[PDB]
Amino acid sequence: PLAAGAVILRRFAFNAAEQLIRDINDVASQSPFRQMVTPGGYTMSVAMTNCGHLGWTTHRQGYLYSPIDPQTNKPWPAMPQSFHNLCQRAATAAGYPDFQPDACLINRYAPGAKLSLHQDKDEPDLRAPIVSVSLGLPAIFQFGGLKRNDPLKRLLLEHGDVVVWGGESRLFYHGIQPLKAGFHPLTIDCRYNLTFRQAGKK
Numbered sequence: 093p094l095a096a097g098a099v100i101l102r103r104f105a106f107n108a109a110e111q112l113i114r115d116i117n118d119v120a121s122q123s124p125f126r127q128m129v130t131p132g133g134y135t136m137s138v139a140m141t142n143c144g145h146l147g148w149t150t151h152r153q154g155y156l157y158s159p160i161d162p163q164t165n166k167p168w169p170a171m172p173q174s175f176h177n178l179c180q181r182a183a184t185a186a187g188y189p190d191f192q193p194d195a196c197l198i199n200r201y202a203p204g205a206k207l208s209l210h211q212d213k214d215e216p217d218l219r220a221p222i223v224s225v226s227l228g229l230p231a232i233f234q235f236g237g238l239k240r241n242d243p244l245k246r247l248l249l250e251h252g253d254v255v256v257w258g259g260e261s262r263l264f265y266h267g268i269q270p271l272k273a274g275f276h277p278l279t280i281d282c283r284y285n286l287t288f289r290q291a292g293k294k
């Protein structure tokens with residue numbers, strides 16, 4: 093496999109994409125996209141929001157999941173039906189039928205935006221996968237291994253592609269390289285990536 097434990101489902105969300113994007117716009121009308129500030133003081137080039145009971149955010153110079161959007165002081169918007177259903181279909185196809193995400197981080201990449209190499213280790217049970225849905229412009233996803241200096245591999249993620257990051261791949265260092273500018277008929281000029289997470293304690 094390209095990444096042990098990962099299940100790549102190319103175009104899995106292609107048919108759902110128009111509805112997914114409508115729902116991104118609805119979520120963002122309530123909890124707007126914002127460029128968060130990292131613990132080191134840098135404003136991220138990616139802009140994010142969340143839906144579900146919990147949302148991933150900066151708070152007090154750390155990362156955590158919160159039931160309240162610090163920008164609005166209101167709950168994050170509820171998980172849209174289209175999100176819930178797509179995630180469950182993908183996770184079930186990939187062999188995680190009990191995956192029940194309570195958070196969905198919505199990440200908007202403008203041209204030039206990137207995500208530096210990192211791990212997602214803020215979740216309480218790292219045996220639960222993360223389901224990652226790409227929409228719009230294509231991006232190069234890089235990933236290594238469990239160690240920061242493991243050799244990097246790269247793959248293009250295109251509109252509609254879903255990856256279920258389970259098993260070992262759940263813990264790999266990964267990132268997204270600077271987004272090339274272009275046109276997409278449904279997102280116009282950007283990429284969105286949805287990452288579904290089980291963030292609450294059992």
Ligand SMILES: O=C(O)CNC(=O)c1nc(Nc2ccc([N+](=O)O)cc2)ccc1O
Nearest residue numbers: 130197199210211212224233249268285287
């Ligand atoms: O776009 C894709 O294809 C994949 N997207 C992600 O892997 C993704 N991951 C996030 N995770 C973070 C965890 C820690 C962190 N840090 O410590 O600085 C920065 C980020 C946050 C948003 C994401 O869209």
Ligand SMILES: [Mn+2]
Nearest residue numbers: 210211212266
């Ligand atoms: Mn990540």
